[PDB]
Amino acid sequence: SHMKFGVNYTPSGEWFYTWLNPKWEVIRRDLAQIAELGADHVRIFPLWTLLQPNRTWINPKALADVRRMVELGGEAGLDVYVDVIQGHLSSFDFVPSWLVSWHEGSMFTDQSAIEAQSALTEAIYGTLSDMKAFAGLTLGNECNQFTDATHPRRMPANAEQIGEWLDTLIGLVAKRCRRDGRLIAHSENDAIWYADGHAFLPRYASCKGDVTTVHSWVFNGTGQHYGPMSCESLGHAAWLVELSKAFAADPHRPVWVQEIGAPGNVIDSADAPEFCRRSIDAIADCPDVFGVTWWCSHRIPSAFSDFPFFEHQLGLFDVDGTLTDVGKAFRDAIATHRDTVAPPRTTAIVIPVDEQGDPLMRAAQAPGGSLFEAWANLNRQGERPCVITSLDAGNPAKLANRGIVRLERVELVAGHAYN
Amino acid sequence: SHMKFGVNYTPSGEWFYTWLNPKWEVIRRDLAQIAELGADHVRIFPLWTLLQPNRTWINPKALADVRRMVELGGEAGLDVYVDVIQGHLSSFDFVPSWLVSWHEGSMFTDQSAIEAQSALTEAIYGTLSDMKAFAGLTLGNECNQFTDATHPRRMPANAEQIGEWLDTLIGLVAKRCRRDGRLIAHSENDAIWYADGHAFLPRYASCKGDVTTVHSWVFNGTGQHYGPMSCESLGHAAWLVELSKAFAADPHRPVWVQEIGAPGNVIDSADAPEFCRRSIDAIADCPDVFGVTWWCSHRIPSAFSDFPFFEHQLGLFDVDGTLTDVGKAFRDAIATHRDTVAPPRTTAIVIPVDEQGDPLMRAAQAPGGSLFEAWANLNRQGERPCVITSLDAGNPAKLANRGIVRLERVELVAGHAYN
């Protein structure tokens, strides 16, 4: 049992631009710094444009560099999780030329592009499969952002095509992962939980892949609307954990807080260490948390432009390599919650869903919405709420398997704070 | 003095994907093969995504790799011309993440992007400036394709903004180039000659930069409409040379046929050698030709996908490294025209222009148009025609400088063969 603690690895000095010519001695020291925090894993991010520059040619040097980074993670004493398709990082898209402009197409529906992503997933798994430190794969960081209606070069897809895309790519490696002792997962930004009409559905995160991933960012309106150090803000990661369980078929499926950070566009730097400590305290009171992975390890140097300004400050280590106050808070939180075990949560707020298990109104569970607030209010009062669907609530076996004793209900009211 | 002969260098084995991890021993063999043809220069193509992955960071390893390729070109005895911004190659766009989707913007009008392109031009010149083999720079291969309405992710610009973009980037290095003995130029696809409404204007090619560049591709409708081995097709490159002079302020400005190939989508493979020989015969009969640079050196291996099929066959050397029949024709053509001197051309076709020197109807000088056909007819009849504008035609001083004796005028009729 017990929560894993790790960091999302942003290479010091050159960020992901380092993949062009990695400085292995610097990367080695980067990973040793992360291990010194007490972290047990890292999550790493190769670039799709370098991995697969042609639809039918994967660059062996790019694969070998991924293997070397994994090897250095293991030498630091870390398990290493690899995100296959980036794809999207920190406001930037990295899309190979064969899926751009004259060759524009949707990664979700174009069959020849799906076969290329399948080959890349297998090539990454196969490259790394003999490494004791290779712990698992995620399809890619927040790939759903490409199909969101807000994306300025949207890759179209309906919900059925998204389900098929997930099934195709996860299905390539799920059995190997199972036989080998590794994990396969996928990752969406919080539009999956919050955005009505979004083609990625909550049950996809909570049922497909081995563990649910959530990425908790209180710049999504939670910090602005309620306050950066409000209960709604501090408990937002714990809220995603419990919300996501409502949509899981398996009553003890682990939930991975795969990203959480203290974004400086809503949280004052003076409050960021307390935000970290208290957010992790709230996560640690939720059962079945797979782990907590902070965003991110090393600050982006100021010589790089066009990042939203707060992205530069998210690193636990400053640009000179020293441990920031948030880094100290995360190190302290790892030690605090080493052997803590959260007790069962038995009072559930109920989410009305349709016959397929999808919310009647995702806006009601978004920031500002009635279900979001009912959970935050119950949490502020010490009730330690969990979340179930109306379908689960009419199933005495599922209530029994989760130990649910009290049901709390609220009408559906859309929030308007979300983004 | 005499025409230069060179090759557009496409790296064997990995194409421009070799820039990720260049195999220097193969690149040396490639360049030695080009020299063995009798070529005296190559044109090379670094990738913008690798050179400048952040708006304010140019990758020093990518600069060092360009320098090494120039160094190997000289060691083979070749002068090396470098295209700064690719940008566009063989149906693919290579645009850095900081100019796409969430960061979408126009390289032609966004000031911060223009300053980045300025920094990249200075960085390439300065990296290469101490090298005996570095012979000059072109801003980039056919950059105008980004601003044409045909482009699916168009970068907007009006004609004045395009002129300012050319002036800004050429102005950075024009003086150094003259002091150092190198050249600076820019390159457009044939929309500049042929497409009404296009924001690149003919006089920009013929007046800005040290030499006019033309890229001659008879799949632009010429080969389809008149026949691949017609006089219209075989004379197309000479036509672009002479057409371009009409718009030059300097009556002896050199014209560089910076690309010509024998595209297999309109020219039968068995005819490509005679197409090469006779196209170059026609170029060699035009005065003031700077040089002829064949597209391209080495065929694209068939393991790479999504190229138009004919692109694979354009190389002078096959994928196994052996010299193709077209390669033999080009080698033979270099020896044939080593010492050729074209006599002056004195019979001129007249292009109607407005007071700024821009054509009244570019469609009339495109394939199928009256001015296009009037030139081809005179050329087929052995009249060796040149081209002037209507402004020049009413100025006996300009007629004197070019030695024009006979004028032929024709009514404007638009072609419809052009793409």
Coordinates of N, CA and C in Angstrom, one line a residue, chain B residues 177-246:
Chain B
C177 N 27.8 40.7 -46.5 CA 28.0 39.9 -47.7 C 28.8 40.6 -48.7
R178 N 28.6 41.9 -49.0 CA 29.4 42.6 -49.9 C 30.8 42.7 -49.5
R179 N 31.1 43.1 -48.2 CA 32.4 43.2 -47.7 C 33.2 41.9 -47.7
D180 N 32.4 40.8 -47.5 CA 33.0 39.5 -47.3 C 33.1 38.7 -48.6
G181 N 32.5 39.2 -49.7 CA 32.5 38.4 -50.9 C 31.5 37.3 -51.0
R182 N 30.3 37.4 -50.3 CA 29.3 36.4 -50.4 C 28.0 37.0 -50.9
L183 N 27.0 36.2 -51.1 CA 25.7 36.7 -51.7 C 24.6 36.5 -50.7
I184 N 23.6 37.4 -50.8 CA 22.3 37.2 -50.1 C 21.2 37.2 -51.1
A185 N 20.3 36.3 -51.0 CA 19.1 36.2 -51.9 C 17.9 35.7 -51.1
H186 N 16.8 35.7 -51.8 CA 15.5 35.1 -51.3 C 14.9 34.3 -52.5
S187 N 14.0 33.5 -52.1 CA 13.5 32.5 -53.0 C 12.0 32.4 -52.8
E188 N 11.2 32.4 -54.0 CA 9.8 32.2 -54.0 C 9.5 31.1 -55.0
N189 N 8.4 30.4 -54.7 CA 7.9 29.5 -55.8 C 7.2 30.3 -56.9
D190 N 6.7 29.7 -57.9 CA 6.4 30.5 -59.1 C 5.1 31.2 -59.0
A191 N 4.4 31.2 -57.8 CA 3.3 32.1 -57.6 C 3.6 33.5 -57.8
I192 N 4.9 33.9 -57.5 CA 5.3 35.3 -57.6 C 5.2 35.7 -59.1
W193 N 5.4 34.8 -60.0 CA 5.4 35.1 -61.5 C 4.0 35.0 -62.0
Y194 N 3.2 34.1 -61.4 CA 2.0 33.6 -62.1 C 0.7 33.9 -61.4
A195 N 0.6 34.2 -60.1 CA -0.6 34.2 -59.4 C -1.1 35.7 -59.1
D196 N -2.1 36.1 -59.8 CA -2.7 37.4 -59.5 C -3.1 37.4 -58.0
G197 N -2.9 38.6 -57.4 CA -3.3 38.8 -56.0 C -2.3 38.4 -55.0
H198 N -1.2 37.7 -55.4 CA -0.2 37.2 -54.5 C 0.7 38.4 -53.9
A199 N 0.9 38.3 -52.6 CA 1.6 39.5 -52.0 C 3.1 39.6 -52.3
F200 N 3.7 38.5 -52.8 CA 5.1 38.7 -53.3 C 5.0 39.1 -54.8
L201 N 5.7 40.2 -55.1 CA 5.6 40.8 -56.5 C 6.8 40.5 -57.3
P202 N 6.6 40.4 -58.6 CA 7.8 40.0 -59.5 C 9.0 40.9 -59.2
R203 N 8.8 42.2 -59.1 CA 10.0 43.1 -58.9 C 10.7 42.8 -57.6
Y204 N 10.1 42.1 -56.6 CA 10.8 41.8 -55.4 C 11.8 40.7 -55.7
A205 N 11.5 39.7 -56.5 CA 12.5 38.7 -56.9 C 13.6 39.3 -57.7
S206 N 13.3 40.3 -58.6 CA 14.2 40.8 -59.5 C 15.0 42.0 -59.0
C207 N 14.7 42.5 -57.8 CA 15.3 43.8 -57.4 C 15.9 43.6 -56.0
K208 N 15.4 42.8 -55.1 CA 15.8 42.6 -53.8 C 16.7 41.4 -53.7
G209 N 17.8 41.5 -52.9 CA 18.8 40.5 -52.9 C 19.7 40.6 -54.1
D210 N 20.8 39.9 -54.1 CA 21.9 40.2 -55.1 C 21.6 39.6 -56.4
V211 N 20.9 38.5 -56.5 CA 20.6 37.7 -57.7 C 19.1 37.3 -57.7
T212 N 18.5 37.3 -58.8 CA 17.2 36.7 -58.9 C 17.2 35.2 -58.8
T213 N 16.4 34.6 -58.0 CA 16.2 33.1 -58.0 C 14.9 32.8 -58.7
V214 N 15.0 31.7 -59.5 CA 13.7 31.1 -60.0 C 13.8 29.6 -59.7
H215 N 12.6 29.0 -59.4 CA 12.5 27.5 -59.3 C 11.6 27.1 -60.4
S216 N 12.1 26.2 -61.3 CA 11.4 25.9 -62.5 C 10.8 24.4 -62.4
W217 N 9.5 24.3 -62.3 CA 8.8 23.0 -62.1 C 7.7 22.9 -63.1
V218 N 7.9 22.0 -64.1 CA 6.9 22.0 -65.2 C 5.6 21.2 -64.8
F219 N 5.5 20.7 -63.6 CA 4.2 20.2 -63.1 C 3.3 21.3 -62.8
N220 N 3.7 22.6 -63.0 CA 2.8 23.7 -62.7 C 1.7 23.9 -63.7
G221 N 1.4 22.9 -64.5 CA 0.5 23.0 -65.6 C 1.1 23.0 -66.9
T222 N 2.4 23.4 -67.0 CA 3.0 23.5 -68.3 C 3.1 22.1 -69.0
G223 N 3.7 21.2 -68.3 CA 3.8 19.8 -68.8 C 2.5 19.2 -69.1
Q224 N 1.5 19.4 -68.3 CA 0.2 18.8 -68.5 C -0.5 19.4 -69.7
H225 N -0.4 20.7 -69.9 CA -1.2 21.4 -70.9 C -0.5 21.2 -72.3
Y226 N 0.8 21.5 -72.4 CA 1.5 21.5 -73.7 C 2.2 20.1 -74.0
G227 N 2.4 19.3 -73.0 CA 3.2 18.1 -73.2 C 4.5 18.2 -72.5
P228 N 4.9 17.1 -71.8 CA 6.2 17.1 -71.0 C 7.4 17.5 -71.8
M229 N 7.5 17.1 -73.1 CA 8.7 17.3 -73.9 C 8.4 18.4 -75.0
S230 N 7.3 19.2 -74.8 CA 7.0 20.3 -75.7 C 8.1 21.4 -75.5
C231 N 8.1 22.3 -76.5 CA 9.0 23.5 -76.4 C 8.6 24.4 -75.2
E232 N 7.3 24.5 -74.9 CA 6.8 25.2 -73.7 C 7.4 24.6 -72.4
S233 N 7.5 23.3 -72.4 CA 8.0 22.6 -71.2 C 9.5 22.7 -71.1
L234 N 10.2 22.3 -72.2 CA 11.6 22.3 -72.2 C 12.2 23.7 -72.1
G235 N 11.5 24.7 -72.5 CA 12.0 26.1 -72.4 C 11.5 26.8 -71.2
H236 N 10.8 26.1 -70.3 CA 10.2 26.8 -69.1 C 11.2 27.5 -68.2
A237 N 12.3 26.8 -68.0 CA 13.3 27.4 -67.1 C 13.9 28.7 -67.8
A238 N 14.2 28.6 -69.1 CA 14.7 29.8 -69.8 C 13.6 30.9 -69.8
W239 N 12.4 30.5 -69.9 CA 11.3 31.4 -69.8 C 11.3 32.2 -68.5
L240 N 11.4 31.5 -67.4 CA 11.5 32.2 -66.1 C 12.7 33.1 -66.0
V241 N 13.9 32.7 -66.5 CA 15.0 33.6 -66.5 C 14.7 34.9 -67.3
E242 N 14.2 34.8 -68.5 CA 14.0 36.0 -69.3 C 12.8 36.8 -68.8
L243 N 11.7 36.1 -68.4 CA 10.6 36.8 -67.8 C 11.1 37.6 -66.6
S244 N 12.0 37.1 -65.7 CA 12.4 37.7 -64.5 C 13.1 39.0 -64.8
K245 N 13.9 39.1 -65.9 CA 14.7 40.2 -66.2 C 13.8 41.5 -66.5
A246 N 12.5 41.2 -67.0 CA 11.7 42.4 -67.3 C 11.5 43.2 -66.1

